[PDB]
Enzyme design. Structure first.
Site: not given
Ligand code: A1N
Ligand code: GDP
Lengths: 125, 872
Positions: B9, B14, B16, B357, B365, B466, B692
């Site tokens: 509120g 209030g 109280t 497409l 598309v 995505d 050697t």
């Protein structure tokens, strides 16, 4: 000019001090007169070596004594983490091994691979 | 059985009343047997953070002498009362504990606090409110934690503290006061949602450097407005005004920059409402455009929907006539860069199934021609709006990258969105149909380009959401090309600032686990899981595509399941990208950095031998060493004692005893040549060439016994100890390997210097392996034909040096700890590297084109960098 390096052979790009060449080449008089001149006994090059390292590598025990009386570092680690004990036990320098362990040598030093001087002494006789 | 009970509120109502049921700061939380009450504060300063502490399990009491955006109303809607029995009657692991109210915890990655559980939720509510002419610095409130302050829209980092700001609007006298000089946009709502102005102000003072271009404007705030000011001809005044409803007024100059600013501001306000206040768009919100026919009368308002209907046909408003571009320059794309503007006479397309497409879940598309070149056109469906086109143009404009699809012209009459045409189609078709053209170089380049596009999108404060092979388009199949793969289909791309994103979008089977939850506020790290899935698909080619349940992640290993050739450092990247915790996943920039390496491309195999096994030699099915003999199938390990063993040559073995055996102290076997520790050189016993320890032998006949180089019958006994004048005498004084192409490249025991000798019998130079570089001492030497010299150091480093200029190509990182023996074998020419891990034996197979691939990759990256710079 830097015309003193060749004199000891017979700094630089690597960082080689004529004391290094004197110790490596086997010249003790040049080492003695260089210590009187006030050179550096704990100078590291690109390879990470110190005159004690080269002295142990070649096998000149007299030079080892001279550099151990001047107050060098008995246990110093190069780029590979090796100390003069490894170089002395790798090439069968028994006298140098004995002399090194009298000045406070660390006999349990582990290199970057994890080996101790005893390992190199046993793997190469 | 327990549940919350909110008492909400206005201030002084209030609340109280709770005490009898048995000015507050923040939220008061108590216990009332069972019901844990949550007394809210009616003072306006806490209204911004009030929504964060509202749940569905509660029993909200509305106390009256906004909130509603099992509620009962009590005066001082399932019931109505005026002033305990009604409340009881009307009221009849970590995540579940939050709803009950024992402790508060937020698992959403955006707040970046998923590893911190705090008990006593009442403490957090009080602490969030003790901080509140609203403006403070960090040190001001330190003496009376700052990650929660900015995460609750309470103290924005500029610290603004939007609450407690001056409610009195200042006297802002703008330039261009005439009607024909300003554009006014009106948003009408029944009320302002709690935190709406704080969120809007926070969003507006984050895009300001990039709303015009990066230049920062002047800013003012009064808790219900903000004035951005770049110049007398480029400003924006977004604030609240009154006429019984709540009005949000946007004022901009009636010029090009003003139109751009109005477009940006309305786009960001619309995205903010969509993301955080979807209730207003379910209509409660009315948008008006203010216009005047002459510059002498009061403004008239027309709804934005009616104006859009009128702009559908013609770009003129008739009663006296006004062009729509000066009333609502965002309906018709007048605020767009105007270089991408449609030229319908120059466009030819037919919209037939044979020219299709693909699809984008909001439009199809099609193949087309625009200005005489083949293009792709995304016709938007009839059940769409201008908002979808505008939020696609948000990414398709202002963002230009070599890995992002390029837009050329956009229209509003058909809502067309002409783009560029990929020459080779999408990656999905290549995976499912053209399985033979996917070389390793092409796979790596596709992955690299997708990672680059993701990195740029994330840097541009945009989340993709995505990422599938269908959205990856191939412009060429030629591996040595700057542009190969691109990213398209920005339909669900949305702004992602430092506030997170709530709506869950993405194709099932290609989305991060958190998004599929649908109740989490996630961030740009959700694209890293999608990239990991895409890398898995590329590695396995067809794989799992030819689903959603086991990727939210229980995926098998790519190699064993689908029988694909091993790709080390790619499987590892897939594993660290497919992490359930977004914070553990690398960023897109880190993924691009990981992929941008030729060690990743050229590492063919990595075989780990059983632990505590030491190898001394190996020959190529690869026969191994150790008395003990082994064998490996390049995987299978067979070992048995036969005698250690020092040298191998097929299978003739050599032991450190003088006994050589054949299975259907010798130190060197070559092909038959025998080299012992005394110096003898046997022929297989045709003759003996005793000198050697002979440990080297090469032909391109050359070798080395001790510190001297011979040839054979001994031709040239080239003594090499006489080199102490260069480098240390310790290094100068036994030869490890002898390698000859034109000179004699010599490596010595524990010597980091690779000596070079002429075959004049004189030294020609020194190679310092520690200068290029951790032990730099040379263990192995290898030659590639007129390409490079491979040096295996005491550590795990391999140095690639050019044979001509002696320049370093690359130092291969520490794959293992110590290179033991290296050789080139016929697997596809490869280089066989045997390493240690001190004791774990370590076999690695490298492609012989490692230096060429290093150079090609660095040149490719530089070319793409210059292309990216030229794009903007
Ligand atoms: C095989 C055939 C297929 N092709 C294409 C092209 C495209 C394409 N190009 N440009 C685009 C821009 C956007 C776009 O949005 C998608 C990802 C929503 C489908 C696709 C394309 N997408 C599939 N296939 C090109 C021709 C030559 O080859
Ligand atoms: N005279 C009178 N005063 C009231 C009544 N109800 C509430 N009040 C006063 O209103 C105040 C309520 O404050 P409160 O709502 O708890 O503050 P808030 O929680 O910040 O909104 C108290 O100080 C009461 O003195 C009433 O029925 N009669």
């Amino acid at each position: 000019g830097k015309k003193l390096l060749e004199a000891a052979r017979a700094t630089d790009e690597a960082g080689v001090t004529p004391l290094h060449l004197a110790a490596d080449s086997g010249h003790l008089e040049i080492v003695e007169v260089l210590l009187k001149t006030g050179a550096d006994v704990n100078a590291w090059d690109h390879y990470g070596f110190t005159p004690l390292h080269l002295a142990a590598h070649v096998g000149h025990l007299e030079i080892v004594e001279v550099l151990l009386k001047a107050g060098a570092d008995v246990n110093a680690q190069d780029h590979a983490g090796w100390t003069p004990l490894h170089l002395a036990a790798l090439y069968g320098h028994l006298e140098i091994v004995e002399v090194l362990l009298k000045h406070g040598a660390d006999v349990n030093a582990q290199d970057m691979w994890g080996e101790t001087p005893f390992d190199l002494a046993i793997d190469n006789g | 059985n327990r549940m919350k009970l909110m008492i909400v509120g206005n201030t002084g109502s209030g609340k109280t009343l709770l005490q009898q049921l048995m000015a507050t700061v923040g939220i008061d939380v108590k216990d009332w047997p069972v019901l844990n009450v949550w007394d809210f504060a009616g003072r306006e300063e806490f209204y911004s953070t009030h929504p964060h502490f509202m749940t569905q399990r509660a029993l909200y009491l509305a106390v009256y002498d906004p909130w509603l955006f099992p509620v009962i109303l009590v005066g001082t809607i399932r019931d109505y009362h005026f002033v305990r029995k009604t409340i009881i009657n009307e009221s009849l692991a970590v995540h579940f504990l939050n709803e009950s109210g024992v402790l508060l915890h937020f698992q959403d990655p955006a707040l970046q606090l998923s590893d911190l559980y705090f008990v006593e939720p009442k403490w957090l509510c009080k602490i969030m409110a003790q901080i509140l002419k609203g403006i403070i610095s960090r040190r001001d409130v330190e003496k009376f934690y700052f990650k929660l302050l900015e995460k609750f829209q309470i103290a924005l980092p500029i610290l603004l503290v939007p609450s407690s700001l001056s409610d009195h609007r200042p006297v802002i006298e703008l330039p261009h006061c005439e009607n024909s000089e300003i554009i006014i946009r009106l948003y009408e709502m029944p009320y302002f949602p709690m935190g709406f102005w704080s969120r809007l102000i926070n969003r507006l003072l984050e895009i300001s450097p990039y709303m015009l271009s990066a230049l920062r404007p002047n800013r003012m705030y009064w808790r219900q407005g903000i004035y951005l000011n770049w110049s007398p001809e480029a400003y924006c005044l977004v604030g609240s005004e009154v006429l019984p409803e709540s009005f949000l007024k946007i004022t901009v100059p009636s010029c090009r920059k003003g139109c751009i600013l109005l477009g940006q501001v309305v786009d960001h306000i619309d995205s903010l409402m969509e993301e955080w206040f979807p209730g207003l768009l379910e209509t409660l919100l009315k948008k008006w455009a203010l216009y005047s026919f002459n510059d002498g009368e009061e403004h008239q308002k027309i709804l934005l929907d009616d104006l859009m209907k009128k702009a559908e046909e013609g770009d003129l408003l008739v009663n006296l006539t006004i062009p729509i571009s000066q009333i609502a320059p965002d309906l018709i794309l007048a605020d767009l860069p105007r270089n991408i503007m449609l030229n319908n006479d120059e466009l030819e397309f037919e919209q037939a199934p044979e020219f299709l497409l693909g699809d984008g879940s909001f439009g199809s598309v099609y193949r087309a021609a625009y200005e005489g070149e083949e293009v792709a056109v995304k016709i938007f469906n009839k059940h769409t709006s201008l908002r979808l086109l505008r939020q696609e143009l948000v990414v398709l404009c202002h963002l230009h990258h070599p890995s992002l699809i390029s837009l050329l012209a956009a229209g509003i009459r058909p809502r067309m969105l002409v783009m560029e045409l990929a020459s080779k189609g999408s990656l999905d078709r290549l995976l499912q149909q053209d399985k033979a053209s996917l070389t390793r170089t092409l796979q790596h380049r596709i992955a690299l380009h997708v990672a680059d596009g993701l990195r740029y999108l994330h840097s541009a404060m945009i989340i993709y959401r995505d990422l599938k092979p269908h959205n990856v388009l191939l412009f060429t199949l030629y591996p040595n090309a700057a542009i190969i793969a691109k990213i398209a289909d920005y339909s669900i791309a949305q702004y992602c600032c430092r506030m997170g994103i709530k709506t869950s979008e993405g194709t099932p089977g290609f989305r991060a686990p958190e998004v599929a939850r649908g109740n989490v506020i996630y961030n740009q790290q959700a694209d890293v899981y999608s990239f990991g899935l895409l890398l898995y698909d590329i590695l396995t080619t067809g794989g799992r595509i030819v689903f959603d349940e086991l990727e939210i992640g229980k995926l098998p290993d790519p190699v064993k399941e689908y029988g694909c050739a091993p790709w080390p450092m790619v499987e590892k990247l897939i594993k660290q990208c497919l992490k359930e915790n977004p914070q553990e996943r690398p960023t897109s920039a880190q993924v691009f950095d990981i992929l941008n390496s030729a060690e990743l491309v050229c590492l063919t195999r990595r075989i780990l031998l059983p632990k505590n096994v030491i190898v001394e030699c190996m020959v190529a099915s690869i026969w191994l060493g150790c008395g003990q003999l082994s064998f490996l199938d390049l995987e299978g390990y067979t070992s048995e004692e036969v005698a250690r063993i020092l040298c191998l040559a097929l299978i003739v073995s050599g032991t450190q005893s003088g006994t050589l055996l054949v299975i259907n102290s010798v130190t060197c076997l070559y092909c038959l040549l025998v080299g012992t520790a005394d110096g003898k050189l046997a022929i297989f016993p045709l003759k003996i060439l005793n000198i050697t320890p002979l440990m080297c032998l090469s032909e391109s006949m050359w070798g080395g016994c001790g510190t001297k180089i011979f040839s054979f019958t001994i031709q040239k006994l080239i003594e090499t100890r006489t080199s102490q004048l260069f480098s240390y005498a310790a290094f100068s004084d036994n030869i490890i390997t002898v390698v000859v192409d034109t000179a004699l490249y010599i490596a010595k025991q524990n010597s980091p210097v690779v000596e070079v000798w002429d075959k004049t019998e004189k030294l020609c130079g020194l190679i310092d392996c520690v200068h290029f570089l951790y032990s730099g001492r040379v263990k192995t030497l290898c030659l590639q034909k007129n390409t490079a010299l491979w040096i295996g150091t005491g550590g795990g480093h391999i140095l690639l040096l050019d044979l001509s200029t002696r320049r370093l190509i690359r130092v291969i990182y520490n794959f293992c700890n110590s290179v033991r023996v290296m050789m080139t074998a016929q697997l596809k020419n490869v280089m066989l590297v045997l390493g240690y891990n001190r004791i774990q034996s370590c076999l690695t197979v490298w492609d012989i084109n490692l230096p060429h691939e290093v150079q090609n990759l660095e040149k490719h990256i530089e070319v793409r960098k210059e292309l990216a710079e030229k794009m903007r």
